[PDB]
Design a protein around this nucleic acid. Structure first.
Lengths: 332, 87, 332, 87
DNA sequence: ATGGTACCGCTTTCAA
DNA sequence: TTGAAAGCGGTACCAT
């Protein structure tokens, strides 16, 4: 039987309508009245009922976060930026795992939308045309984090995954390597087949090097799929001189898979991972990687959302954060 | 009221630390600003700062100008050395 | 006013009350009547407003999760569990990082309590007498995940940390070790000072082996605090023959920092981790660790909470899940 | 109904996979149980199944009595292999 | 199978 | 400043 503003309104010989004013810090309240009702709110241990407020104010100070799998090492970090900037801006968060499953991603969107969220941050892997339609249907701002949306319709925030893989491939050729392989992730995702892959095949025909349609291994970000990715590659006759992994977890699988075959790093081969997570630094040797400001990608995303949610004008919706390459020991 | 620093940070201005600095600036009324490689962004703007893409090395200049640009530049220094972000 | 239940009622030519039944799925509807409104709901692109329901039904079908840091390999994996079991029971999550900061923890407690959550899954490192008194005066049930509460008076789900470290130490004694060292986490936390450490000390006690203060290295969970810890123990005159880390992070911090000093694991030094995380099978050599059903903990935690929320009775408020020890290559 | 298995998953009857099973069991009217090492628990319960600790290389029984006590067993069985949890 | 209708706790004009 | 009252979108008990 929670105590509402009515009880406080009674416990202070004032109108519930003014109790409200105090609570939200309304200026037009005589010091005597305020201070009188403030000690009353405490004398009853009153806590405002957000739901009640949200029905009336149409504002819930809560954004929705649709993330594939919060257990990951990548997204979990992203979630930190997202979560942390939202707190800065007094916004609670509703986290929910989609597991890259579409029926789920859309269902969640609806659920959060239903719970009257002031905005949403969508971290998807396959934003189809159907997502766009759903997105365009949200009454509140929707921001994309570290995702690849072909349509270019929803305001996203991430790094150039195309130019990112390119820089790497280049640096690799810019050091002698000619037979370089790329272990991507599920090609089913538009970020692999259309952004990471392109930057790989592009930087090759850009260096004359003939595209080797057998140096493109398809992993799944797993530590094992990367292990088996290096075993398949070192099976062909024309075995790669250096390999580029779409992420760190596949990169580590590769380093170890080689050492498991007696191969030595970086002596025998040169590996370069991606994302640059705590993982690419807790290995022997240490993993070289295309640095991706995961936290910054989420924190920025949440920042940009804060803007849209406040209707405040925002120049350019699609944002791109700067990326770089950090070599450790998996490269000579 | 300004002062240059040499990003001692291992990762530069990014992650939480970055957030820490940006917030410190928001603590004051003054118009705290940051300059880098010929580009000045509000130090109170998570976006402006994180968009410059700072990293170990490159030196920066933290501006300031307000009825409290003093205590402000001081605080900014604190955190700047609290998260090992230059000096 | 924008496409509300009342709108559907007129449109489907029925009454608010009836529409509500259809929406909710009440069986007392004529197959012809339901159809009418379902099509009207469709034709009007109606979405029921959960906030409204919230105020009316006195429950938001959402639970607040106060976790210290979502970017933690462990805390993150733990969260997932809680989350997969929340969807299972038609519940939503409000995630928020406390960073073991008491002030922030007791705060978020309220924020959520005001947000009218149906329940809370709290996760901390130092549940004080206040937290407790705070937990006991919640209008909703609270369940602690993977935490330690000396006052054992709040329904929690976790493993017997004191027994874990014991069985690991003991397993090492039985291997012939006479100088076993312990690398813990922050002693401030009762899980280290009061549980794991005492488990370690109680092990040598029943092993009739003397307690060597120098064989207790206090990490901070940091993969780096581990390297720095291995060093200090090797700095001693009489070095340990095997070391036990309270976390996998520090464990790899032990392994690598050793392999670097030359020592060769396991043939030179025995090492056992704790938590059995993803890092376990992602190191070289494989890390032998105490298995903790991290996922299960948050999962059984969320389920125990669904029970309490549904005012249904339960056997034993405090629950404890089994823990085993997966031995790998880091152990001879 | 009945059918004993021998967990193959290193993880055993835990994590996400274990969840799938408890759920797949909740979809049938037939009270589905789970016995292991001597004790029997309600397989349509998360706390029960997990509090068991069924580690890899262990035997368990899966009963089911009531309406759908047959098609049920088939289902759980199909999942047990679709999630690499023993034959 | 339906319609009627007090609330649910708080925000927001509108007047006094 | 301060109070009175109309909602906001639903739910649920009560009638019909």
């Amino acid at each position: 039987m929670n105590i509402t503003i009515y009880d406080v309104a009674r416990e202070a010989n004032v109108s519930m309508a003014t109790v409200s004013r105090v609570v939200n810090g309304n200026p037009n309240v005589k010091p005597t009245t305020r201070k009188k009702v403030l000690e009353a709110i405490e004398r009853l241990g009153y806590r405002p009922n957000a739901v009640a407020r949200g029905l009336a104010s149409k504002k819930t100070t809560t954004v929705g976060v649709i993330i594939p799998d919060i257990s990951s090492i990548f997204y979990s970090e992203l979630a930190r930026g997202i979560e942390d900037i939202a707190t800065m801006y007094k916004y609670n968060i509703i986290l929910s795992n989609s597991d890259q499953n579409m029926e789920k991603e859309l269902h969640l969107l609806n659920t959060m939308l239903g719970k009257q969220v002031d905005g949403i941050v969508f971290m998807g892997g396959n934003i189809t045309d159907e997502h766009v339609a759903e997105f365009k249907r949200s009454p509140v701002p929707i921001v994309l984090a570290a995702s690849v949306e072909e349509q270019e319709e929803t305001p996203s925030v991430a790094i150039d995954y195309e130019q990112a893989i390119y820089d790497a491939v280049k640096l690799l050729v810019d050091k002698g390597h000619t037979d370089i392989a790329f272990v991507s992730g599920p090609m089913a995702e538009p970020i692999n087949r259309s952004k990471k892959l392109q930057g790989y095949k592009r930087a090759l025909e850009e260096a004359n090097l003939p595209f080797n349609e057998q140096f493109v291994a398809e992993g799944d970000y797993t530590y094992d799929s990367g292990l088996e990715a290096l075993q398949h590659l070192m099976s062909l006759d024309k075995k790669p001189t250096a390999i580029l992994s779409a992420t760190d977890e596949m990169a580590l699988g590769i380093i170890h898979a080689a050492q498991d075959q007696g191969l030595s790093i970086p002596e025998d081969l040169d590996i370069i991972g991606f994302d640059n997570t705590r993982l690419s630094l807790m290995v022997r040797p240490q993993l070289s990687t295309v640095v991706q400001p995961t936290y910054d990608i989420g924190a920025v995303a949440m920042r940009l959302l804060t803007k849209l949610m406040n209707k405040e004008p925002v120049e350019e919706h699609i944002v791109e954060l700067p990326h770089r390459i950090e070599l450790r020991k998996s490269t000579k | 009221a300004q002062k240059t620093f040499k990003v001692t940070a291992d990762s530069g201005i990014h992650a939480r630390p970055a957030t820490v600095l940006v917030q410190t600036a928001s603590k004051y009324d003054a118009d705290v600003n940051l300059e880098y490689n010929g580009k000045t962004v509000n130090l109170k703007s998570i976006m402006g700062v994180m968009s410059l893409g700072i990293a170990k090395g490159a030196e920066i200049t933290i501006s300031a100008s307000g009825a409290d640009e003093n205590d402000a530049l001081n605080a900014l220094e604190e955190t700047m050395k609290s998260e090992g972000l230059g000096e």
